[PDB]
């Protein structure tokens, strides 16, 4: 994309939007390609717009005692808003004076209207240019208002994201990803296009006054009956608006909960597949969809009654204000038609425009005040910066998260260059001490003193989208030698050689492509690359086998960076020997502090101190029977539609019979033509849909969306693992938030309105044509053109709508990846980099959002131009042929345009319906996603020539394996960090593209359905899955056990005093990924789940990931006690864990080797045998 | 009080304005700089240590800066204020010109700024208040300083600022056209070679506060011609650790438009002194140095020069 033509177009061209023609003509013939998009205008860039708003927001904060957010918005846009409002007012005023001319032109078709005819030519000339004036003053103002709304939305979004990065940890627990996604999704498109309606608050009364003054010309004092009726109806509509706002504000709560559950469940699809919980989650989400539907369907009835007032009021307003005048004195038939002509505009002004404007204000001001409240929360205060301290001092520090203090009487001191090793049991406070040092957990007592320049290696490894190189350098200047030394010292070169594109391999969000140890070592390399005073290493040696762990500890920590003052969290009696000071914690208090001896009693030299624009690459990933599939998905909707058509035909027949069959009114054969004019001008009420036909349609159209949502969720949960990686987190959030909110709220009422207008047009034409068939012939050229232009526009508008629909996924994926790395971002200090990335994504969205509005305005201006030219052309021929008596020609031709006055509005509604139908097309694409795919007795298992690869036609990870497991025999699976050892035990579950034969117990794995095959395997995933809910719901999401057998299991795994330390025993609400629990307790929770579900086959992958030996004894005892009779595959790096197993399977160079002895295994590999600690070497060898 | 004090200062300044090397040691050199050098001297008769700024006459005439030196001498004579370094004796020799200034042991603030990296907001505000008072006093006398930079401001024993180097100063009522100064600290109007007035020192104060709070100047580039482009563009991005209040203050001070420049509109100094960022600084007490300094430089006697290079 390049060089937006808007900036370099002429004034006459942009008055008519002729500059958008090339992208319509290139795209009518064949697919709109990435070369056809344009650059964003320079004024519309997110960079120079958020700064322009915050310039005034900071001034408001620093100057006022009671700051309001709506004063920066006012003093940024007020004049340019009012400037278009002024012209929009004369776009309305010129509409109400049309009857003054038109009811005189029609009146001329009468022999005895002597003076009226004599001057009609000048009235026709005056009407000719009034249309030209009216069409020009209206559209540019509306387009400018749309642009102003877009700019306001962009600025507020950028300000909100810039605010987010500096929130305190206290308020983080109150702000989940679902709340932010709901906040930014509910305003993403409605806010831009809603700005055009706000001005009608002050236009509508100034219009009603004018219309009442004009009606006083006709009806004298009797006109006020319609005014009173309309005022009563407006009051009723205001009450309906109150009720509808109530229901929406009540409903808002559950959406965030359902969204966070959905995102957590889809991200961890691996564990859901392994546990076979792919049916419990559907029930959990359905139970929350039920109440949300119960509220939205109740609000829809109020929306219907609010939208139905226009159609029904048409007849009563006219009747009630012209009946008393006729009752007293005889009236001419012409006055009724003139009154109807004014009353149509009065009805539109009162009943349709004003309440929409009032609702627009109630929504916009509520959103602005919500953002204003968001901006005033607690902020993380930065640590003091001082380059000359050379010493870390901690003294008398105690801390509370909110009873028992987390830390109590903690103090230590270390000089430049010293290594201090933190040790202690699980849950003692090891990580919270690093959180206190980093300044996230500000201590209640004491002080902390250091340089303020730190580097952090989180215990939970974090990876954001990009390559390995970009992840390691992490937004700093590239260096050739520093990077090579870092990537070599971490033993990571061994694994880079396996990847196809080496260092440039693209990693997805969360690094799901990589193994555990690879991701941990990438985070370690990122920590090492950063130049800082203090290094905070939070147990990087968790997932690494002893050889690689020992090599990394010797080479990197102790030799490459021997001049830094690093802090290493470790629980091995080999690392404490190398350290200078030892700190041991227990139950939160300090147990020991001193030298190791008392316990028994220049590569990294220094370091010195992005485009905001889309060039070509960023806009690359973005690149009729849908109605039938939507209609036929629900069987009752067809019956409802047939019912509607039956009643429509009955009404049409009755109206035709009455009109064929025909004091207080003066009517003569000379002026009898007004009957059809009055019928056409009042047909809006006779052929309207009452609630007997309105309410069932709205009810069924909402019942459809629940079926669509349930089907989409079911199809997502059944997809094969290979195709789920092609998706992104932002696409999931997009499709479950926006394309479901649209499906519930906007679509039913818009379809209702479109159907109503279409039925009115068809009924009017059908009834009026039968009595004398020449309107139908006279109306063909307009009907044909209104369809030809619509097709020509839609051919490109569909593609533009699709491209805009995919532009908003990067926003959500950036938003979801930002919150996971917040502590790492603030520790490293990379906020401007992520702000620039988010502004780039915003510009990417705006580039596609702008062209859709430009083309829509072009179309809506062309259709009114066609109407104007046909009106002028027909008016001149109508008036020319009134040569002194019985203007037959005009009676037909002028009547032929009152139908088009509403057919144009029906065609305008058709484009809205089609635009909103794109979400249905995007939803159906997810349903069509391909689907994946006592007996256990003993557990004897046999494989033959098993091969596994993650992608079909890809590179094989392992092949040609023929081992055999005896019943009830422990198998110790072993290997280096990254070998295929997890792939071997994942192939038993058939989660990846596999080939071969597995013969568990004698029944071939191909002879059983997947859901019955996979049930026999009890698993402990390496990736612990904790979802929002209660402890009881976490331990069994089926409720098939009740509180006694749960306590009988939880105490074995040492969870007694871990659960009971919370206010709700077995009922505490775990939130935000279960962050309340320590990392060591999550392993015990997974072990408890495995203990509850007694299966004959067990696949334990890293059962003891981080816990120290004093806690590992629990895992040992429960492995020997709870399921001693079951066969288990024990994949683990702990050497002590390979003392119980009696068969071993070592994986090396993509094939397996079997050993039925542990002594023989160590003899054939010297380096591994020489790396184990002496403590285990004397346990193994006698 | 303050108005009467300023009237008295302006009244007594005029009386001194209209009425304008064998007793010195060469123990140390405290940085030469430009034409000449400043050497440390010790008073034989009393023992008080002083500075001694030498100036080259041939370089003065060659560089076409002769008015600068003479009016510098005469101004540094006439002015009297606690935060300005006072001149005691003036020399006139056939080789060079020498001026004796009172010794300031604490050395440069620039060294401390490059040593610590950056000051916290109260630490910056403490010096900002003193600079605001100094500019109020100087502008009350119709003087222009026009060479504010961290390399001109020393630190005394107690920790207060000591202003030196009045070379480019000038007493003027109205408009001036002379171009001079350090490229990052130049205002847009002087860059454009147009007439400019006393408002430039507020731009210098804004850029000084930005540099002191962040550790690096806002408008910074390789070539001087690029720095001029960045200055005339007027576009700047603030770092994360800046508070909203200080951001507003710097946006008002560093504004390109001369008319709406802060400290120039309608009240002169009250727009700045009443700002929210100075809500907790008692001006009357800080004038009389009754507040505790947040940084006290270690001096090891009158002869110690460990703070200097
Ligand atoms: O992982 P290990 O095996 O190596 O042991 P450990 O490192 O020492 O475990 P610790 O991290 O030190 O946790 C120590 C205790 O503190 C509790 N605890 C932990 N997090 C707690 C919490 N969270 C609110 C603050 C918060 C945390 C994360 C993200 C946002 C906000 N609110 C309240 N109590 C929280 C936790 O149950 C523990 O009993
Ligand atoms: O924790 P450790 O220290 O014990 O390491 P490990 O146990 O041996 O881990 P392994 O899985 O054996 O890693 C083995 C190799 O396979 C690659 N690899 C691993 N997982 C990969 C992957 N996953 C996404 C597709 C998928 C399909 C089915 C189920 C889950 C994920 N998509 C693509 N390549 C994937 C990975 O780069 C490795 O080079
Ligand atoms: N009163 C003083 N006591 C002690 N040292 C001083 C004093 N005034 C200046 N100095 C030191 O001497 C150096 C030069 O003095 P200075 O007054 O700035 O002459 P200058 O040539 O005009 N400086 P410049 O224009 O930047 O090149 C400064 O860097 C100070 O460190
Ligand atoms: Mg931990
Ligand atoms: Mg693994
Ligand atoms: Mg000098
Ligand atoms: Mg100097």
Author numbering:
A (entry chain A): 1 to 402, 437 to 635, 806 to 813, 820 to 833, 846 to 884, 903 to 1173, 1203 to 1451
B (entry chain G): 15 to 34, 41 to 329
From the paper:
An example of a protein activated by PKA is the cystic fibrosis transmembrane conductance regulator (CFTR), an epithelial anion channel crucial for salt–water balance of the lung, intestine, pancreas, and sweat duct. CFTR gating (opening and closure of the pore) is under tight control by its regulatory (R) domain, a mostly unstructured segment containing 10 consensus PKA-C phosphorylation sites. Phosphorylation by PKA releases the R domain from its inhibitory position, permitting ATP-induced dimerization of its nucleotide-binding domains (NBDs) to open the channel. The PKA-C consists of a small N-terminal lobe (N-lobe) and a larger C-terminal lobe (C-lobe) joined by a flexible linker.
